[PDB]
Amino acid sequence: ERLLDELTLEGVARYMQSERCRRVICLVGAGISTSAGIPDFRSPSTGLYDNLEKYHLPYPEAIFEISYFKKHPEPFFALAKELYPGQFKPTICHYFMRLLKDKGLLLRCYTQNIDTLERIAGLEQEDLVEAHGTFYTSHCVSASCRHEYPLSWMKEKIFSEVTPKCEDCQSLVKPDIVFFGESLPARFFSCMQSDFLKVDLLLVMGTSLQVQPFASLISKAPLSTPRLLINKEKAGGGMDFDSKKAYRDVAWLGECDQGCLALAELLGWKKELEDLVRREHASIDA
Amino acid sequence: ERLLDELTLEGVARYMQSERCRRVICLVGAGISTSAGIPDFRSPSTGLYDNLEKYHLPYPEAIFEISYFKKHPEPFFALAKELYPGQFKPTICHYFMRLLKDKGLLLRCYTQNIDTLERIAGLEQEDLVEAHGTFYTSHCVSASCRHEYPLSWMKEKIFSEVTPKCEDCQSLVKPDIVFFGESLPARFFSCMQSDFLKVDLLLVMGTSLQVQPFASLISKAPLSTPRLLINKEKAGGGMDFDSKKAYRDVAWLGECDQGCLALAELLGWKKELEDLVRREHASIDAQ
Amino acid sequence: ERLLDELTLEGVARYMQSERCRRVICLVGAGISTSAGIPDFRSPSTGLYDNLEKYHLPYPEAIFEISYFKKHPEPFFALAKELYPGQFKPTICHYFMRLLKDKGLLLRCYTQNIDTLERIAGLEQEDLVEAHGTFYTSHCVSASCRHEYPLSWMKEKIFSEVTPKCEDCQSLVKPDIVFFGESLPARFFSCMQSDFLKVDLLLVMGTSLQVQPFASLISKAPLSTPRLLINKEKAGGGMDFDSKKAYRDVAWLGECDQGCLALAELLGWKKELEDLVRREHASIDAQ
Amino acid sequence: ERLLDELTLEGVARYMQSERCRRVICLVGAGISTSAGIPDFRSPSTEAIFEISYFKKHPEPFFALAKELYPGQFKPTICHYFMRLLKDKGLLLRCYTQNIDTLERIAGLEQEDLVEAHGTFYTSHCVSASCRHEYPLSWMKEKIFSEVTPKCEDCQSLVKPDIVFFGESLPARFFSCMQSDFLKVDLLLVMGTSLQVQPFASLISKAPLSTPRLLINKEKAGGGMDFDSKKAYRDVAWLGECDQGCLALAELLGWKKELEDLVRREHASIDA
Ligand SMILES: CCCCCCCCCCCCCC(=O)O[C@@H]1[C@H](O)[C@@H](COP(=O)(O)OP(=O)(O)OC[C@H]2O[C@@H](n3cnc4c(N)ncnc43)[C@H](O)[C@@H]2O)O[C@@H]1O
Ligand SMILES: CCCCCCCCCCCCCC(=O)O[C@@H]1[C@H](O)[C@@H](COP(=O)(O)OP(=O)(O)OC[C@H]2O[C@@H](n3cnc4c(N)ncnc43)[C@H](O)[C@@H]2O)O[C@@H]1O
Ligand SMILES: CCCCCCCCCCCCCC(=O)O[C@@H]1[C@H](O)[C@@H](COP(=O)(O)OP(=O)(O)OC[C@H]2O[C@@H](n3cnc4c(N)ncnc43)[C@H](O)[C@@H]2O)O[C@@H]1O
Ligand SMILES: [Zn+2]
Numbered sequence A: 001e002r003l004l005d006e007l008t009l010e011g012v013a014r015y016m017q018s019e020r021c022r023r024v025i026c027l028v029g030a031g032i033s034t035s036a037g038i039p040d041f042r043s044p045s046t047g048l049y050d051n052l053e054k055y056h057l058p059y060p061e062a063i064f065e066i067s068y069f070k071k072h073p074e075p076f077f078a079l080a081k082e083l084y085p086g087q088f089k090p091t092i093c094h095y096f097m098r099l100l101k102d103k104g105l106l107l108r109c110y111t112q113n114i115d116t117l118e119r120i121a122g123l124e125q126e127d128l129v130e131a132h133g134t135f136y137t138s139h140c141v142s143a144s145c146r147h148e149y150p151l152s153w154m155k156e157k158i159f160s161e162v163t164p165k166c167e168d169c170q171s172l173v174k175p176d177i178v179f180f181g182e183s184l185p186a187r188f189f190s191c192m193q194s195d196f197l198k199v200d201l202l203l204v205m206g207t208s209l210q211v212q213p214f215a216s217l218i219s220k221a222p223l224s225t226p227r228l229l230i231n232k233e234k235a236g237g238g239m240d241f242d243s244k245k246a247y248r249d250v251a252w253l254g255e256c257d258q259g260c261l262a263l264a265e266l267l268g269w270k271k272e273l274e275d276l277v278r279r280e281h282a283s284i285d286a
Numbered sequence B, C: 001e002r003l004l005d006e007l008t009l010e011g012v013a014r015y016m017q018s019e020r021c022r023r024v025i026c027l028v029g030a031g032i033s034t035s036a037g038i039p040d041f042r043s044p045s046t047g048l049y050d051n052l053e054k055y056h057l058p059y060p061e062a063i064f065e066i067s068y069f070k071k072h073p074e075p076f077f078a079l080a081k082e083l084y085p086g087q088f089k090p091t092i093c094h095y096f097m098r099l100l101k102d103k104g105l106l107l108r109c110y111t112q113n114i115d116t117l118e119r120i121a122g123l124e125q126e127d128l129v130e131a132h133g134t135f136y137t138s139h140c141v142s143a144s145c146r147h148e149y150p151l152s153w154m155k156e157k158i159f160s161e162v163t164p165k166c167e168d169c170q171s172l173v174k175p176d177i178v179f180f181g182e183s184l185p186a187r188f189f190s191c192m193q194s195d196f197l198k199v200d201l202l203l204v205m206g207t208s209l210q211v212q213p214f215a216s217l218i219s220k221a222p223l224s225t226p227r228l229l230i231n232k233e234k235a236g237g238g239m240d241f242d243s244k245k246a247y248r249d250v251a252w253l254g255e256c257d258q259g260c261l262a263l264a265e266l267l268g269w270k271k272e273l274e275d276l277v278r279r280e281h282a283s284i285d286a287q
Numbered sequence D: 001e002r003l004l005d006e007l008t009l010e011g012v013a014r015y016m017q018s019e020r021c022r023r024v025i026c027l028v029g030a031g032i033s034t035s036a037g038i039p040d041f042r043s044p045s046t047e048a049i050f051e052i053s054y055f056k057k058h059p060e061p062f063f064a065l066a067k068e069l070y071p072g073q074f075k076p077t078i079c080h081y082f083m084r085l086l087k088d089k090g091l092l093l094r095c096y097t098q099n100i101d102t103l104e105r106i107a108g109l110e111q112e113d114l115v116e117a118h119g120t121f122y123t124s125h126c127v128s129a130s131c132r133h134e135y136p137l138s139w140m141k142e143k144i145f146s147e148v149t150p151k152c153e154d155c156q157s158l159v160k161p162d163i164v165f166f167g168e169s170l171p172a173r174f175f176s177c178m179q180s181d182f183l184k185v186d187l188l189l190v191m192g193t194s195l196q197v198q199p200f201a202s203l204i205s206k207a208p209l210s211t212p213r214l215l216i217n218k219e220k221a222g223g224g225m226d227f228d229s230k231k232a233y234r235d236v237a238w239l240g241e242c243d244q245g246c247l248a249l250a251e252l253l254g255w256k257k258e259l260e261d262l263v264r265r266e267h268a269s270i271d272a
């Protein structure tokens, strides 16, 4: 019945090495990019939502709300200036997903992040569902124009403190983040309907799973599919680590980078991971 | 529209005297502690990175990487023995920041240094973002223990050439430095998100700004905010001293202590600064 | 005549949410800082005035009287040693006023306290009438000198049990408290004459309203202005909570922190308030 | 003028034997109870759940934790009974305690001897201000172990143990004692505390500059004490076990046998 021999990281690692673990889905969020210097959303003191006071919003969520944006874009672009990283360097956790890809294990990475770090780690477009879009490209908001602008144009406007206006039609230009009030990307719908029918392992990292419909994804997997959480805290998506009925869900509590190193060590991959991280970090820094 | 009347130290000092200049942020590195007997990292011949061959490292950065530390901690602690100062005596530069604090000008000092000298100079923790942590406290590496050990305990282990181990759990004890591979302190995150919205002056001292995310901090300030560099050389993080579009950045090239004395002179603080330094140095010497 | 739909905290909260209430004045005393470890003045056994025997004063008030201070400063500084707080950590009540500022509802906080916790909570100089002055700054008492000294300087003197003397003239150095016999701050008179004519709500917290002229402020608002008292006991004057003629005054009897938490909950601000308190308290606790 | 002849336990004992040392204040924390099998709650190996407004809405988590953390027995240490002997010899002005484990009361310190800084688990009170009914340790325990949320037998409001929850005021006795105790204290005895948490940590700096201060603790306390510098004149650190420090001090005062006898008989009485 139970696919894992025990509900521990060691059990997960032994299952990953067995013949039946062939397709892996990663589900990630802002916690996997904190060690790259990008704050998460909900951590006390450090998270974005604990640092919005000086933007004098009518309510905290307005700064990521499409209707507020169209009326008052200034706070969002001020925030962009304060958070824009100035180097885009993926974490150990990101490179662990790259190893999954290189060893033919990665079916998909579902990400709530907009930082583009999955791509920089070497995950290709087909490997990814960018459920919140991306900062990488920007567009005029007018549906009858939709002129595209690259990262270098948008960055220029952000750091010069000029509100991005479209060069054709003078409408606001917005990064391709899915703001509150905008539709999810088509790839979310297309990929979610097939990926979870036949997946052997879910790896949930650096997310509190507080936002639908992303949170519901883990429940779509087969009943027998083991699920591993690598996170600072127990997240709020129907995982059962503790009950008498617990049979497939494992939590490793701590930093995403440490958890990925620990899992890599059990798999015999730790040296390869650390070499990959060193080489890519060295390259990005040069 | 340009907040400085000219791109000189005199210009910065006059701006600093004006009503508009109320909140100053200092951003500092290892250059401000070389006159306190601690080498910087990147200066040719004298800096730490030109003096690592004898430690027989796989690559230079290994000695400050958490993963290498956990495996082979000996080189780090042998290095700690060679660099640990005989006394902790802040510089003129550190006491200049103390003056900024006492005159109600200092919003924050962001430091890359681990030497605790900002604190010894009388900057309180509230005034500081210790971006690389501190040597002042140490901790057991085990997440399920984290037994705290003071400077005096860590110092004794270093000079007796015994690798620091936990008294409770026998795992490695590490100084609270942020090694390569470790997360930045929480306070960097929280302060970084508010301090740079409303800042009137940046003072960048004794740093080459080669390392992210610290280097990006100066670009978070308003476009209008004047920025003064006091450093031996131009820093390698988006400042524009020399181009035809230069409007707000000023470089004073030389020793940090000398620049701070020059600025203090222009502000009418030189005698007060010199008297504070003399007093505090005598007091520390007397211990 | 009746701007509140009922004389309850819930009525006050619905009035505050409406368009009718745009300008709030807070009037605060020592009760808002008891949970921050500073005693109040009048409470039996626990209050400051019940604990003055050991200072062998000619009479209770002498310790806060300018003329007695100049002749015998020592009891004041020994008292300052005993009450000086371990940290300056504002209470939930302080941060509730911070919320009033951030939502554009705070016309003014009038404070009788000298503990500086309104400032530390993030209320700016412009939001405040510091009616009793402040411990934050100190001055030489001599009119022809008036050298200013910072809190750190004053603390050092307090804990070393050396009476503060000015470095220039050797006159006594006094914290900027408005001692008895001293003129009231200019801001008290100027703000009163424009604030109380357009106030929509008075929030009276942690004060017995026993001392004049501060107590009289509550009668300066228009007769239609609702007034909420959040205090352990009914304040001893002018306010009518209980008679058949009662129409605008509401008492919430209990701890200021708990009263403010209750009011915030009714307003839909509980989480916003608690998040703010938590992040500010965590920051201060890490010094 | 240094009140100690030397900065050692022996110097402290000789000071304690002089007519000058009449009034002792003990400042204690979790380190004094770890020998009684009570866990140091701040130790990482060994916040709504302690907040008053959350408790009134969701009390179950607190009482589930109370069931788990409830000690097998309340059995004070050699250290606690050293304080009992200080009381019995007329030396104890006050014990200021950070612990809620009640071991001071069981050791025979009376409420008049005590300032419980974070309150006490010994008594419980109904949350209604218009009722405020008191309940003993024995009643609260029965509620905790039956896994029924305790309600008041008169008004059906929540009954809460007298721990000072977050968002509650400091106790009255903190204010009334703190304002007089430290002006006339002759010796501070700080035991089993790191002195990192405020406002408790600041209590030691309220004593006069001349007042000797003895630290009995495993480590140096991390709030403004000077054992080592060439200016050191009054602070003494005895490093090791609180029980062993107290035995060694008792021995120098000629109290060791009395202390041992008290400990043994009380331990026996409690076990029975
Ligand atoms: C290139 C950057 C440019 C800057 C421009 C700014 C644009 C900001 C992006 C707008 C995003 C759209 C609006 C929005 O608010 O989306 C949010 C977000 O997409 C969604 C999901 O949130 P999420 O990704 O789950 O992030 P949370 O902050 O809610 O949770 C993170 C979790 O991880 C943990 N954690 C933290 N750090 C670590 C670590 N190092 N190791 C292990 N775990 C870690 C935390 O304990 C926590 O459980 O909820 C929110 O609608
Ligand atoms: C307290 C006991 C000490 C012994 C312990 C030794 C352990 C060392 C711990 C190292 C921390 C690990 C990670 C690490 O390597 O951090 C480094 C560092 O924190 C970061 C930033 O580097 P930084 O602080 O900018 O230091 P640099 O050496 O790169 O730059 C110093 C700059 O200043 C200039 N300069 C020099 N002297 C003067 C002077 N007197 N006046 C004016 N300018 C001066 C130089 O010309 C140069 O531009 O880059 C590196 O990751
Ligand atoms: C920062 C360093 C501090 C140490 C320095 C020491 C110097 C401080 C003395 C400054 C000199 C000022 C002279 C002076 O005596 O001013 C006094 C004072 O400013 C003025 C006004 O008195 P007040 O602020 O109204 O203080 P009271 O004690 O008269 O009344 C406090 C009220 O609050 C209540 N209460 C208590 N706790 C709570 C609580 N937690 N929740 C709710 N309510 C609470 C009490 O029940 C009481 O009704 O009358 C007096 O001249
Ligand atoms: Zn367009």
Ligand SMILES: [Zn+2]
Binding pocket: B140, B141, B142, B145, B146, B147, B166, B167, B168, B169, B170, B171
């Ligand atoms: Zn340990």
Ligand SMILES: [Zn+2]
Binding pocket: C140, C141, C142, C145, C146, C147, C166, C167, C168, C169, C170, C171
């Ligand atoms: Zn003077």
Ligand SMILES: [Zn+2]
Binding pocket: D126, D127, D128, D131, D132, D133, D152, D153, D154, D155, D156, D157
């Ligand atoms: Zn009751």
